[PDB]
Amino acid sequence: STKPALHFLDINATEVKKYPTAIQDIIINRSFDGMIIRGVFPRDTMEQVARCLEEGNDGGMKSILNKNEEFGTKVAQIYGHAIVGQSPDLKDYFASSAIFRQACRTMFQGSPDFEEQVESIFHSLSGLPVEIPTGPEGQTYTPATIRLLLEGREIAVHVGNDFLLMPAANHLKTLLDLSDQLSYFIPLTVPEAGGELVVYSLEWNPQEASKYAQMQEYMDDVEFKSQSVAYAPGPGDMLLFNGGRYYHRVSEVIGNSPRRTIGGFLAFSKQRDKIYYWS
Protein backbone atom coordinates (compact mmCIF):
# COMPACT_ATOMS: atom_id res chain seq x y z
CA SER A 1 0.00 0.00 0.00
CA THR A 2 1.14 3.50 -0.98
CA LYS A 3 -1.73 5.35 0.70
CA PRO A 4 -0.62 8.36 2.80
CA ALA A 5 -2.23 9.08 6.17
CA LEU A 6 -4.53 11.80 4.85
CA HIS A 7 -5.82 12.66 1.36
CA PHE A 8 -4.88 16.09 0.07
CA LEU A 9 -5.33 17.63 -3.37
CA ASP A 10 -2.73 19.89 -4.93
CA ILE A 11 -4.07 22.45 -7.43
CA ASN A 12 -3.07 25.78 -8.88
CA ALA A 13 -5.14 28.80 -7.91
CA THR A 14 -5.96 29.34 -11.63
CA GLU A 15 -7.92 26.06 -11.46
CA VAL A 16 -10.18 26.62 -8.42
CA LYS A 17 -13.29 26.86 -10.62
CA LYS A 18 -12.86 23.19 -11.52
CA TYR A 19 -13.62 22.31 -7.87
CA PRO A 20 -16.91 24.10 -7.16
CA THR A 21 -17.88 21.62 -4.38
CA ALA A 22 -14.47 21.14 -2.72
CA ILE A 23 -15.55 22.71 0.59
CA GLN A 24 -18.62 20.47 0.68
CA ASP A 25 -16.40 17.50 -0.25
CA ILE A 26 -14.05 18.10 2.70
CA ILE A 27 -16.64 18.93 5.39
CA ILE A 28 -19.72 17.03 4.30
CA ASN A 29 -18.64 14.07 2.18
CA ARG A 30 -15.16 13.73 3.76
CA SER A 31 -13.93 12.61 0.41
CA PHE A 32 -10.61 14.33 1.04
CA ASP A 33 -8.98 16.06 3.94
CA GLY A 34 -7.34 19.22 2.59
CA MET A 35 -5.69 20.91 -0.40
CA ILE A 36 -2.76 23.04 -1.30
CA ILE A 37 -3.73 25.82 -3.71
CA ARG A 38 -0.58 27.19 -5.29
CA GLY A 39 -0.21 30.82 -6.22
CA VAL A 40 -3.26 32.34 -4.54
CA PHE A 41 -1.12 35.45 -4.10
CA PRO A 42 1.86 36.48 -6.23
CA ARG A 43 5.29 35.99 -4.66
CA ASP A 44 5.90 39.74 -5.12
CA THR A 45 2.84 40.63 -3.04
CA MET A 46 4.04 38.28 -0.31
CA GLU A 47 7.51 39.89 -0.34
CA GLN A 48 6.06 43.41 -0.15
CA VAL A 49 3.74 42.55 2.77
CA ALA A 50 6.60 40.87 4.58
CA ARG A 51 8.76 43.94 4.07
CA CYS A 52 5.98 46.09 5.54
CA LEU A 53 6.02 43.97 8.71
CA GLU A 54 9.82 43.81 8.92
CA GLU A 55 10.27 47.52 8.36
CA GLY A 56 7.19 48.66 10.31
CA ASN A 57 5.38 50.60 7.60
CA ASP A 58 2.54 48.21 8.34
CA GLY A 59 -0.55 50.36 8.73
CA GLY A 60 -0.47 49.92 12.51
CA MET A 61 -0.26 46.12 12.40
CA LYS A 62 2.70 46.22 14.81
CA SER A 63 0.40 47.82 17.41
CA ILE A 64 -1.48 44.51 17.76
CA LEU A 65 1.56 42.25 17.88
CA ASN A 66 1.23 39.91 20.86
CA LYS A 67 4.69 38.57 21.66
CA ASN A 68 3.29 35.99 24.09
CA GLU A 69 6.33 36.35 26.34
CA GLU A 70 4.36 35.12 29.40
CA PHE A 71 3.80 31.76 27.63
CA GLY A 72 7.51 30.97 27.31
CA THR A 73 10.18 30.72 24.63
CA LYS A 74 8.61 28.06 22.33
CA VAL A 75 5.37 29.92 21.46
CA ALA A 76 4.40 31.79 18.30
CA GLN A 77 3.88 35.53 18.28
CA ILE A 78 0.65 36.71 16.74
CA TYR A 79 -0.58 39.90 15.13
CA GLY A 80 -4.20 40.30 16.18
CA HIS A 81 -6.13 38.40 18.88
CA ALA A 82 -7.25 34.98 17.72
CA ILE A 83 -10.73 34.13 18.92
CA VAL A 84 -9.62 30.80 20.54
CA GLY A 85 -7.57 32.82 23.05
CA GLN A 86 -10.49 35.05 24.25
CA SER A 87 -13.18 35.69 26.93
CA PRO A 88 -16.87 35.37 25.84
CA ASP A 89 -17.51 39.14 25.77
CA LEU A 90 -14.98 39.45 22.91
CA LYS A 91 -14.52 43.22 23.52
CA ASP A 92 -10.71 43.25 23.09
CA TYR A 93 -11.00 40.75 20.24
CA PHE A 94 -13.40 42.93 18.26
CA ALA A 95 -11.22 46.00 18.75
CA SER A 96 -8.08 44.19 17.56
CA SER A 97 -10.07 42.91 14.61
CA ALA A 98 -10.88 46.45 13.52
CA ILE A 99 -7.22 47.38 13.63
CA PHE A 100 -6.25 44.20 11.79
CA ARG A 101 -8.65 44.70 8.91
CA GLN A 102 -7.52 48.28 8.25
CA ALA A 103 -3.82 47.45 8.57
CA CYS A 104 -4.10 44.37 6.39
CA ARG A 105 -5.94 46.30 3.72
CA THR A 106 -3.23 48.99 3.75
CA MET A 107 -0.38 46.53 3.39
CA PHE A 108 -1.86 44.59 0.46
CA GLN A 109 -2.55 47.81 -1.46
CA GLY A 110 -5.36 46.11 -3.45
CA SER A 111 -2.74 44.11 -5.36
CA PRO A 112 -4.76 41.97 -4.78
CA ASP A 113 -6.65 42.79 -1.61
CA PHE A 114 -6.33 40.02 0.98
CA GLU A 115 -10.02 39.70 1.87
CA GLU A 116 -11.21 39.96 -1.78
CA GLN A 117 -8.72 37.30 -2.94
CA VAL A 118 -9.46 34.79 -0.12
CA GLU A 119 -13.19 35.31 -0.62
CA SER A 120 -12.74 34.67 -4.36
CA ILE A 121 -11.09 31.33 -3.63
CA PHE A 122 -13.67 30.18 -1.11
CA HIS A 123 -16.52 31.21 -3.43
CA SER A 124 -14.99 29.28 -6.30
CA LEU A 125 -14.52 26.18 -4.12
CA SER A 126 -18.10 26.18 -2.79
CA GLY A 127 -20.49 28.16 -5.08
CA LEU A 128 -21.59 30.05 -1.98
CA PRO A 129 -21.45 33.65 -0.79
CA VAL A 130 -18.53 34.30 1.56
CA GLU A 131 -18.57 36.67 4.58
CA ILE A 132 -16.58 37.68 7.63
CA PRO A 133 -19.03 37.28 10.52
CA THR A 134 -20.45 40.29 12.35
CA GLY A 135 -20.77 40.46 16.10
CA PRO A 136 -23.96 40.94 18.00
CA GLU A 137 -23.56 44.73 18.28
CA GLY A 138 -22.24 45.16 14.75
CA GLN A 139 -18.56 44.50 15.49
CA THR A 140 -16.37 42.81 12.92
CA TYR A 141 -14.66 39.49 13.47
CA THR A 142 -11.18 39.45 12.02
CA PRO A 143 -10.72 37.52 8.72
CA ALA A 144 -7.29 36.38 9.80
CA THR A 145 -4.37 36.75 12.16
CA ILE A 146 -0.66 36.70 11.27
CA ARG A 147 1.51 34.16 13.07
CA LEU A 148 5.21 34.86 13.44
CA LEU A 149 7.46 31.89 14.34
CA LEU A 150 11.10 32.83 15.07
CA GLU A 151 13.92 30.34 15.10
CA GLY A 152 13.18 27.55 17.58
CA ARG A 153 9.49 28.41 17.79
CA GLU A 154 6.55 26.11 17.04
CA ILE A 155 2.82 25.83 17.16
CA ALA A 156 1.93 23.04 19.58
CA VAL A 157 -0.57 20.31 18.74
CA HIS A 158 -4.23 21.27 18.94
CA VAL A 159 -7.48 20.59 17.10
CA GLY A 160 -10.04 23.09 15.79
CA ASN A 161 -13.24 21.50 16.99
CA ASP A 162 -12.21 22.14 20.64
CA PHE A 163 -13.39 25.71 19.89
CA LEU A 164 -16.99 24.51 20.07
CA LEU A 165 -16.55 23.86 23.83
CA MET A 166 -15.05 27.32 24.53
CA PRO A 167 -17.22 30.21 25.80
CA ALA A 168 -15.59 32.49 23.23
CA ALA A 169 -17.51 30.54 20.57
CA ASN A 170 -20.94 31.26 22.01
CA HIS A 171 -21.85 33.95 19.48
CA LEU A 172 -20.42 32.13 16.44
CA LYS A 173 -22.34 29.02 17.47
CA THR A 174 -25.50 30.98 16.67
CA LEU A 175 -24.28 31.46 13.02
CA LEU A 176 -22.26 28.35 12.10
CA ASP A 177 -22.79 24.82 11.10
CA LEU A 178 -21.53 23.03 14.18
CA SER A 179 -19.80 20.25 12.21
CA ASP A 180 -16.12 20.58 11.29
CA GLN A 181 -14.41 23.83 10.74
CA LEU A 182 -11.60 24.16 8.26
CA SER A 183 -8.25 25.91 8.64
CA TYR A 184 -6.67 28.08 5.94
CA PHE A 185 -3.35 29.86 5.82
CA ILE A 186 -0.97 31.42 3.36
CA PRO A 187 2.76 31.87 4.10
CA LEU A 188 4.12 35.36 3.78
CA THR A 189 7.71 34.16 4.39
CA VAL A 190 8.93 30.61 4.81
CA PRO A 191 11.86 29.43 6.93
CA GLU A 192 15.01 27.71 5.69
CA ALA A 193 13.74 24.42 7.11
CA GLY A 194 11.28 23.24 9.68
CA GLY A 195 8.06 25.13 10.21
CA GLU A 196 6.04 22.33 8.62
CA LEU A 197 2.34 21.86 9.16
CA VAL A 198 2.02 18.34 10.57
CA VAL A 199 -1.50 16.91 10.37
CA TYR A 200 -2.27 13.67 12.26
CA SER A 201 -4.85 11.21 11.07
CA LEU A 202 -6.08 11.08 14.67
CA GLU A 203 -9.54 12.62 14.85
CA TRP A 204 -11.04 14.92 17.50
CA ASN A 205 -11.46 13.06 20.78
CA PRO A 206 -11.90 15.69 23.50
CA GLN A 207 -12.73 13.25 26.25
CA GLU A 208 -9.49 11.30 25.80
CA ALA A 209 -7.29 14.30 24.95
CA SER A 210 -8.48 16.00 28.19
CA LYS A 211 -6.67 13.41 30.31
CA TYR A 212 -3.29 14.84 29.30
CA ALA A 213 -1.68 17.98 30.65
CA GLN A 214 0.25 18.14 27.34
CA MET A 215 -1.72 17.26 24.19
CA GLN A 216 1.55 16.15 22.57
CA GLU A 217 1.68 13.31 25.09
CA TYR A 218 -1.68 12.08 23.76
CA MET A 219 -0.30 12.04 20.23
CA ASP A 220 2.76 10.18 21.49
CA ASP A 221 0.59 7.55 23.24
CA VAL A 222 -1.46 6.86 20.11
CA GLU A 223 1.78 6.53 18.08
CA PHE A 224 2.66 3.52 20.32
CA LYS A 225 -0.65 1.68 19.57
CA SER A 226 2.11 6.61 8.42
CA GLN A 227 0.09 8.45 11.10
CA SER A 228 0.65 12.02 9.88
CA VAL A 229 1.44 14.12 6.81
CA ALA A 230 3.67 17.20 6.64
CA TYR A 231 3.26 20.22 4.36
CA ALA A 232 5.44 23.27 3.65
CA PRO A 233 3.48 25.52 1.29
CA GLY A 234 5.53 28.23 -0.34
CA PRO A 235 4.83 31.98 -0.13
CA GLY A 236 1.46 32.83 -1.53
CA ASP A 237 0.21 29.21 -1.59
CA MET A 238 -2.90 28.47 0.51
CA LEU A 239 -3.17 25.35 2.63
CA LEU A 240 -6.82 24.57 3.30
CA PHE A 241 -7.49 21.57 5.49
CA ASN A 242 -9.79 19.95 7.99
CA GLY A 243 -8.11 21.37 11.11
CA GLY A 244 -11.38 21.05 12.98
CA ARG A 245 -11.34 17.24 12.77
CA TYR A 246 -7.62 16.40 12.76
CA TYR A 247 -5.01 17.15 15.43
CA HIS A 248 -2.21 19.28 13.92
CA ARG A 249 0.87 21.32 14.79
CA VAL A 250 3.61 23.38 13.20
CA SER A 251 7.11 22.02 13.64
CA GLU A 252 9.95 24.11 15.02
CA VAL A 253 11.49 26.66 12.70
CA ILE A 254 15.09 25.93 11.72
CA GLY A 255 17.38 28.85 10.89
CA ASN A 256 17.05 32.57 11.38
CA SER A 257 14.50 33.32 8.61
CA PRO A 258 11.11 33.46 10.39
CA ARG A 259 7.94 31.71 9.28
CA ARG A 260 5.13 34.25 8.80
CA THR A 261 1.67 33.03 7.91
CA ILE A 262 -1.69 34.77 7.51
CA GLY A 263 -4.84 32.79 7.98
CA GLY A 264 -7.70 31.56 10.02
CA PHE A 265 -10.71 29.26 9.82
CA LEU A 266 -13.82 28.78 7.74
CA ALA A 267 -17.11 26.94 8.13
CA PHE A 268 -20.55 26.84 6.66
CA SER A 269 -23.47 28.81 7.96
CA LYS A 270 -26.10 26.68 9.75
CA GLN A 271 -28.09 26.19 6.52
CA ARG A 272 -24.85 25.55 4.54
CA ASP A 273 -25.79 28.36 2.14
CA LYS A 274 -22.87 30.66 3.02
CA ILE A 275 -19.26 30.40 4.08
CA TYR A 276 -17.99 32.32 7.10
CA TYR A 277 -14.25 32.86 7.62
CA TRP A 278 -12.51 34.34 10.64
CA SER A 279 -9.65 33.98 13.04
Ligand SMILES: O=C(O)CCC(=O)C(=O)O
Ligand atom coordinates in the same frame (compact mmCIF):
# COMPACT_ATOMS: atom_id res chain seq x y z
O1 LIG B 1 0.56 28.02 10.68
C1 LIG B 1 -0.45 28.70 10.88
O2 LIG B 1 -0.44 29.91 10.57
C2 LIG B 1 -1.72 28.01 11.43
C3 LIG B 1 -1.63 26.48 11.55
C4 LIG B 1 -2.90 26.01 12.24
O3 LIG B 1 -2.93 25.51 13.36
C5 LIG B 1 -4.22 26.09 11.46
O4 LIG B 1 -4.22 26.52 10.28
O5 LIG B 1 -5.28 25.71 12.08
Ligand code: NI
Ligand atom coordinates in the same frame (compact mmCIF):
# COMPACT_ATOMS: atom_id res chain seq x y z
NI1 NI C 1 -4.86 25.04 14.01
